[PDB]
Amino acid sequence: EREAHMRSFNISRASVLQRLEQLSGDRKQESLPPHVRLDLAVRLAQHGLYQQATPIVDELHHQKALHAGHYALLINALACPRLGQRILHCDAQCDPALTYKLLGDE
Amino acid sequence: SFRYTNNLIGALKHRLLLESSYREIASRKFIGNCRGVEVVCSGYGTVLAVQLTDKAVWESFYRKTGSLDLDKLAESIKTALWDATRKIRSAKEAALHRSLSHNTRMRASADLKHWYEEDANTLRPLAFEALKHEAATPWMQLVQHGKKEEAAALLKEFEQKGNREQPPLASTLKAEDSNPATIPIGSVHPLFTPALVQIEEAGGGSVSNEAVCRAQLWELSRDEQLFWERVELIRKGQVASIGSS
Amino acid sequence: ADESEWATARRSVLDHAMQHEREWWFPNEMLDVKDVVTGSTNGLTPQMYPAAVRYGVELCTVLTAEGKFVDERGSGLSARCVVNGTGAAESVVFDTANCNGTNTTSVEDALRVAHGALRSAQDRHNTLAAFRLGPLSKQSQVLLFCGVNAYEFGGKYARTYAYAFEKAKKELEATAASGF
Amino acid sequence: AEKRGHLLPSLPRNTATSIDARAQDIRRLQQKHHRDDIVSFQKLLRSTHAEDSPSAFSSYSDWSYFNPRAVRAEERDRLTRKAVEALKLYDSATNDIYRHSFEDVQACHTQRVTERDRTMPPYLPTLPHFVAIIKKDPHISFLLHIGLPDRNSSEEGSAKHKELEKRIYYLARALYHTALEYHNETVRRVNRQKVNVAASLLDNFVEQEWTTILRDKHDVTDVTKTLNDTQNDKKQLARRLGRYMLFANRSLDDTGFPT
Amino acid sequence: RNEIVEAKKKQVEEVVRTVPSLAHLHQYATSLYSRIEERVA
Amino acid sequence: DARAVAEKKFNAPPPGMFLRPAHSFRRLAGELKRRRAQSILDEVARAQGMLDLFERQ
Amino acid sequence: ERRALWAEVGPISDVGSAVTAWIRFGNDPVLHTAVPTMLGGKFRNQQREKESLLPNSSSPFAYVEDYMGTNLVFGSPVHAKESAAVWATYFERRYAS
């Protein structure tokens, strides 16, 4: 069951990184709508990939496309609630205090 | 028993995750800003571009009438470069912690944290070996990353046929080069890479089962002759008969 | 370089390499190579070899290189940059003493000078590290390629290291760390 | 003296390479005080004086006439170190010319070199190993690059940088000397106190500059809210950095010693 | 002096045509020396 | 004189070791190491004797 | 026994594969060939040699011999007869035993 949860998280993280590489390669000069970049930054930050999401947030804040709820959505996604599920089911052995203790390492 | 083989598997899983993540960091952009100054670097720390986002609004801050600051601007380039270099070193620590988290749940890799003791100063990509890896030709980047079947085809088309916003290793290291299954046995460890290539195939990147079995079978013929020459030395056998004069 | 070109610059290089680049060219007994013949056998110990590479990597990380750049578009902008071994910059300074005629330089021109001063100083550090870690890694490849029978993965134990390499791959293939 | 020296310049004598008033003051600081090579790796780790002159203080234009033993001490120690490296070159050659038996080298290759236990570990504490750990601190890496003013721009920025580099090499050398005398317990209790006085020197300096660059930047008031920037700054990276973990508070494993 | 510097020049060009990897490394050295060398103007 | 008659007999080593053959890479580099380091030791003691001579010992 | 048979190819067969290997080892063809060569504490200068029968190469692979001072491959003919005299002396004493 631990290997199954690890496999599921790695497949989802690979899909998110492939979506990011597709939106960065094919859309080199075509400017994306702001909500697609917002959803991509949220899905990047939720999977523990915070460095790949912060230039998107800098561009969205510089374009003044972000509003009151979108900032709270980005900060809540920065707590990584998809890496937390893998650390729950594999690393912390389902101890919910140990998820907070082990998410501070990443 | 089998304490060496079970520890070698845990070390090579640590080396495969540290090789597949070095190819993820090096083919990536690291953008740091201070005050509208986009300093873009790659994973190797080389500055790709020193840009300015929205020149119309950031012109009045550096008073381009007036004279240029060259101290507000100089402290903005250095801060944006320092903020971009630490994101490289924070990504190498995320590469090391993910390499152990896939290993310490299987083979108790907390001791490999002690047996290696690596940090961002020692984890690859190193910024002072950035010249020979980034400024190399695309054929030389295919032979530095152990891709023989792709560098031989790029060499054949060299024979018969005849502010850059991208890191120079992004063309070589694609998304499929982040898999450890494609990583050969020669480049899994940059310390012993002059010696691990004899294990590897001549034309391919996989392990040559014929040459590996040949290196063992040459040792087995030498050690058997060392065995039976010592049985003759230690314990002599019974002597046959003659006729005394 | 001609010998006439080196002789006129021999005084100005060697006093700079003694004042500012002293730690780059000072002899360090763990790193320097005294002999090309017996460097791999007598000098470099195969047990002391991974500690010397770590000693050299940690040394060039904390050291200091410098590089300058002059604007090629007529302006007398000169920028001097000091770059560590991590890629970061310690000091960025501009020189306006060469150009008296001013107010014709945009902010895009000044960033292009600083981009050239960082590119010159980072390539200065990469060439200085290629001569400090240069001859040690050359004697390393003689010790490892011709000394596979002294190591844990040559001879009869090459089959074990290849078996552990394939077994490490299937344990990453069982999870999605390889197949994804 | 300069007129008589320039008339015979090819005569390779015992060189001084300074003026008459310059070499008198250079011999004044050399024979009355020790040189400062704290920021160097190789020279300070092998720093050793073969002789000293304590109960002697004369004029250095006349001390060469009164007591020529102490004024000839430096180039005599230079010939002493030249005698050792020739002998180290001599002892390295006997392994080159002479070899063991063939059955002896066969016995070595039965016990292969294993990376885990048979190799020396790469994380052994050296002198630049401790400078790299002490500069990996995000508060020290801030003050080295962007926290202090540039050493090339201003003359006070170089004074803050040389003071910062003095206390970095103080703590790194004390941690380097602790690992050398770690096998015995007598000097190890002393070297732990050498670290605690060297760590408190740097913790006093970092917390002095951190209160400086925060409070002085409170008086500049650069207003960039109209620019809609990314909120990176000199203050806004310093206040977003955490609390400064003091080096006197840290144990040995937090300052580079292996666990 | 001119007889030796063309003796090596045809010697290098025979080496380049036999080994096609060395023809690729001559293009690397010219592109690297354009980056490292201090420009004069 | 003892080094001469010992060298002429081989056409003194440490007791547990042997002698490499001539015209080999390690022996020629080792004999060049011994030839240069001997010349340093003559010029060190000679120049240090000039220091004691002009000190009026 | 059927998988592993005779082989005369070696790990590096030709010079064209040696160039491919020399870059994979971590070497820069400009930087790691521009290093000076030091022999006995004295650097080799402008390729000037005085009664030196050592080979002249900045590559340290050119001086590789056996532990017994034997180079039966690529050796000079005065050294290759002395290298074959060592193993003919050792295997005389070994096989007469």
CSV table of C-alpha atoms in Angstrom, one decimal, chain D residues 27-211:
chain,number,residue,atom,x,y,z
D,27,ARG,CA,61.5,44.9,10.3
D,28,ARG,CA,59.8,46.9,13.1
D,29,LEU,CA,56.5,45.2,12.6
D,30,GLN,CA,58.1,41.8,11.9
D,31,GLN,CA,60.3,41.6,15.0
D,32,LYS,CA,57.8,43.1,17.5
D,33,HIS,CA,54.6,41.5,16.3
D,34,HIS,CA,53.3,38.5,14.4
D,35,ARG,CA,52.0,38.7,10.9
D,36,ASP,CA,48.2,38.4,10.2
D,37,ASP,CA,47.6,35.4,7.8
D,38,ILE,CA,44.2,34.5,9.3
D,39,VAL,CA,42.3,34.5,6.0
D,40,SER,CA,44.6,32.0,4.3
D,41,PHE,CA,44.0,28.3,4.2
D,42,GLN,CA,47.3,26.6,3.6
D,43,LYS,CA,49.7,29.1,5.3
D,44,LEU,CA,47.7,29.4,8.6
D,45,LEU,CA,47.1,25.7,9.0
D,46,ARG,CA,50.8,25.0,8.6
D,47,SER,CA,51.9,28.2,10.4
D,48,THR,CA,55.0,27.5,12.5
D,49,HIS,CA,57.8,29.7,13.6
D,50,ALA,CA,61.2,28.0,14.0
D,51,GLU,CA,62.8,30.8,16.1
D,52,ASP,CA,61.8,34.0,18.0
D,53,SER,CA,63.5,37.0,19.4
D,54,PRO,CA,62.0,38.2,22.7
D,55,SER,CA,64.7,39.6,24.9
D,56,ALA,CA,66.2,41.8,22.2
D,57,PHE,CA,65.1,45.1,20.8
D,58,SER,CA,67.5,47.3,18.9
D,59,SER,CA,67.4,49.8,16.0
D,60,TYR,CA,67.0,47.7,12.9
D,61,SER,CA,69.7,49.6,11.0
D,62,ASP,CA,72.0,48.7,13.9
D,63,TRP,CA,70.5,45.4,14.9
D,64,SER,CA,72.1,43.8,11.9
D,65,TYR,CA,75.4,45.0,13.3
D,66,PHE,CA,74.7,44.2,16.9
D,67,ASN,CA,73.0,40.8,16.8
D,68,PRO,CA,73.1,39.3,13.2
D,69,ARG,CA,71.4,36.1,14.4
D,70,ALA,CA,67.9,37.4,14.6
D,71,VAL,CA,68.0,39.5,11.4
D,72,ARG,CA,69.2,36.4,9.4
D,73,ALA,CA,66.4,34.2,10.7
D,74,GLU,CA,63.9,34.5,7.9
D,75,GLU,CA,66.0,33.3,5.0
D,76,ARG,CA,67.6,30.7,7.2
D,77,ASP,CA,64.1,29.3,7.9
D,78,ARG,CA,63.5,29.6,4.1
D,79,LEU,CA,66.5,27.3,3.6
D,80,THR,CA,65.1,25.1,6.3
D,81,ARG,CA,61.8,24.6,4.5
D,82,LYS,CA,63.8,24.1,1.3
D,83,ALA,CA,65.7,21.3,3.0
D,84,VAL,CA,62.5,19.5,4.0
D,85,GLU,CA,60.8,19.6,0.6
D,86,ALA,CA,63.9,18.2,-1.1
D,87,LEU,CA,63.9,15.4,1.4
D,88,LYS,CA,60.1,14.9,0.9
D,89,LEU,CA,61.0,14.7,-2.8
D,90,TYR,CA,63.7,12.2,-1.9
D,91,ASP,CA,61.4,9.9,0.2
D,92,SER,CA,58.8,9.9,-2.6
D,93,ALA,CA,61.3,8.5,-5.0
D,94,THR,CA,62.2,5.3,-3.1
D,95,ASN,CA,58.6,4.0,-3.7
D,96,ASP,CA,59.1,4.9,-7.4
D,97,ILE,CA,62.4,3.1,-7.9
D,98,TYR,CA,61.8,0.1,-5.6
D,99,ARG,CA,58.8,-2.3,-5.7
D,100,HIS,CA,57.4,-5.1,-3.6
D,101,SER,CA,57.2,-8.7,-4.7
D,102,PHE,CA,54.6,-10.0,-7.2
D,103,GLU,CA,53.0,-12.2,-4.6
D,104,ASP,CA,52.7,-9.2,-2.2
D,105,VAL,CA,50.7,-7.1,-4.7
D,106,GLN,CA,48.6,-10.2,-5.5
D,107,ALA,CA,47.6,-10.3,-1.8
D,108,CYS,CA,46.5,-6.6,-1.9
D,109,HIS,CA,44.1,-7.2,-4.8
D,110,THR,CA,42.2,-9.9,-2.9
D,111,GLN,CA,41.1,-7.1,-0.5
D,112,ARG,CA,39.4,-4.7,-2.9
D,113,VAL,CA,38.9,-1.0,-2.2
D,114,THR,CA,35.3,-0.6,-1.2
D,115,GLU,CA,33.8,2.9,-1.2
D,116,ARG,CA,31.7,2.4,2.0
D,117,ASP,CA,34.3,1.2,4.6
D,118,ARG,CA,37.7,0.8,2.9
D,119,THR,CA,38.0,4.3,1.5
D,120,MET,CA,38.7,7.3,3.7
D,121,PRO,CA,35.4,9.2,4.1
D,122,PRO,CA,35.1,12.3,2.0
D,123,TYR,CA,33.4,14.4,4.8
D,124,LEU,CA,36.6,14.6,6.9
D,125,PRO,CA,36.9,18.1,8.5
D,126,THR,CA,39.4,20.3,6.7
D,127,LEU,CA,39.9,24.1,7.0
D,128,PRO,CA,37.9,25.1,3.9
D,129,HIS,CA,35.2,22.6,4.9
D,130,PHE,CA,34.5,24.8,8.0
D,131,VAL,CA,34.5,28.0,5.9
D,132,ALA,CA,32.0,26.5,3.6
D,133,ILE,CA,29.6,25.4,6.4
D,134,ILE,CA,29.9,28.8,8.1
D,135,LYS,CA,29.1,30.6,4.9
D,136,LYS,CA,26.1,28.3,4.2
D,137,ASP,CA,24.3,30.2,6.9
D,138,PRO,CA,21.6,32.4,5.3
D,139,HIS,CA,22.4,35.3,7.6
D,140,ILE,CA,26.1,35.2,6.8
D,141,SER,CA,25.5,34.6,3.1
D,142,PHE,CA,23.3,37.7,3.3
D,143,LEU,CA,25.9,39.9,4.9
D,144,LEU,CA,28.7,38.6,2.6
D,145,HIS,CA,27.0,39.6,-0.6
D,146,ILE,CA,24.2,42.1,-0.1
D,147,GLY,CA,23.9,42.8,3.6
D,148,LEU,CA,27.1,44.9,3.8
D,149,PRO,CA,28.0,47.6,1.4
D,150,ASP,CA,30.4,46.7,-1.4
D,151,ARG,CA,34.1,46.5,-0.7
D,152,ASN,CA,35.0,48.0,-4.0
D,153,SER,CA,32.5,50.9,-3.8
D,154,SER,CA,33.2,52.5,-0.4
D,155,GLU,CA,36.1,52.4,2.1
D,156,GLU,CA,33.7,51.5,4.9
D,157,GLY,CA,32.3,48.6,3.0
D,158,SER,CA,35.8,47.0,2.8
D,159,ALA,CA,36.2,47.6,6.6
D,160,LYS,CA,33.0,45.8,7.3
D,161,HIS,CA,34.0,43.0,4.9
D,162,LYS,CA,37.5,42.5,6.3
D,163,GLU,CA,36.0,42.4,9.8
D,164,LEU,CA,33.5,39.9,8.7
D,165,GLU,CA,36.2,37.7,7.1
D,166,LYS,CA,38.3,38.0,10.2
D,167,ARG,CA,35.6,36.4,12.4
D,168,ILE,CA,34.7,33.8,9.9
D,169,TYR,CA,38.2,32.5,9.8
D,170,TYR,CA,38.4,32.7,13.6
D,171,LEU,CA,35.6,30.2,14.1
D,172,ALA,CA,36.6,28.0,11.2
D,173,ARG,CA,40.2,27.7,12.4
D,174,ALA,CA,39.0,26.9,16.0
D,175,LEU,CA,36.7,24.2,14.7
D,176,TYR,CA,39.6,22.9,12.5
D,177,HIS,CA,41.9,22.8,15.6
D,178,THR,CA,39.2,21.0,17.6
D,179,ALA,CA,39.1,18.1,15.1
D,180,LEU,CA,42.9,17.7,15.2
D,181,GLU,CA,43.0,17.4,19.0
D,182,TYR,CA,39.8,15.4,19.4
D,183,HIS,CA,41.5,12.1,20.2
D,184,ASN,CA,42.7,13.3,23.6
D,185,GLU,CA,40.4,14.8,26.3
D,186,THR,CA,42.8,17.4,27.8
D,187,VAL,CA,43.0,19.8,24.9
D,188,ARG,CA,39.5,19.0,23.7
D,189,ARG,CA,38.1,20.8,26.8
D,190,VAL,CA,40.3,23.8,25.9
D,191,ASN,CA,39.4,23.8,22.2
D,192,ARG,CA,35.7,23.7,23.0
D,193,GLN,CA,36.3,27.1,24.8
D,194,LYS,CA,38.3,28.3,21.8
D,195,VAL,CA,35.2,27.7,19.6
D,196,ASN,CA,32.8,29.4,22.1
D,197,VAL,CA,34.9,32.6,22.2
D,198,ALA,CA,35.3,32.6,18.4
D,199,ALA,CA,31.6,31.9,17.8
D,200,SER,CA,30.5,34.7,20.2
D,201,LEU,CA,32.8,37.1,18.3
D,202,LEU,CA,30.9,36.4,15.0
D,203,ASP,CA,27.5,36.3,16.7
D,204,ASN,CA,28.2,39.7,18.2
D,205,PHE,CA,29.1,41.0,14.7
D,206,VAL,CA,26.2,39.5,12.8
D,207,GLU,CA,23.7,40.7,15.3
D,208,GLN,CA,25.3,44.2,15.2
D,209,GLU,CA,25.0,44.5,11.4
D,210,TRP,CA,21.5,42.9,11.4
D,211,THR,CA,20.3,45.6,13.7
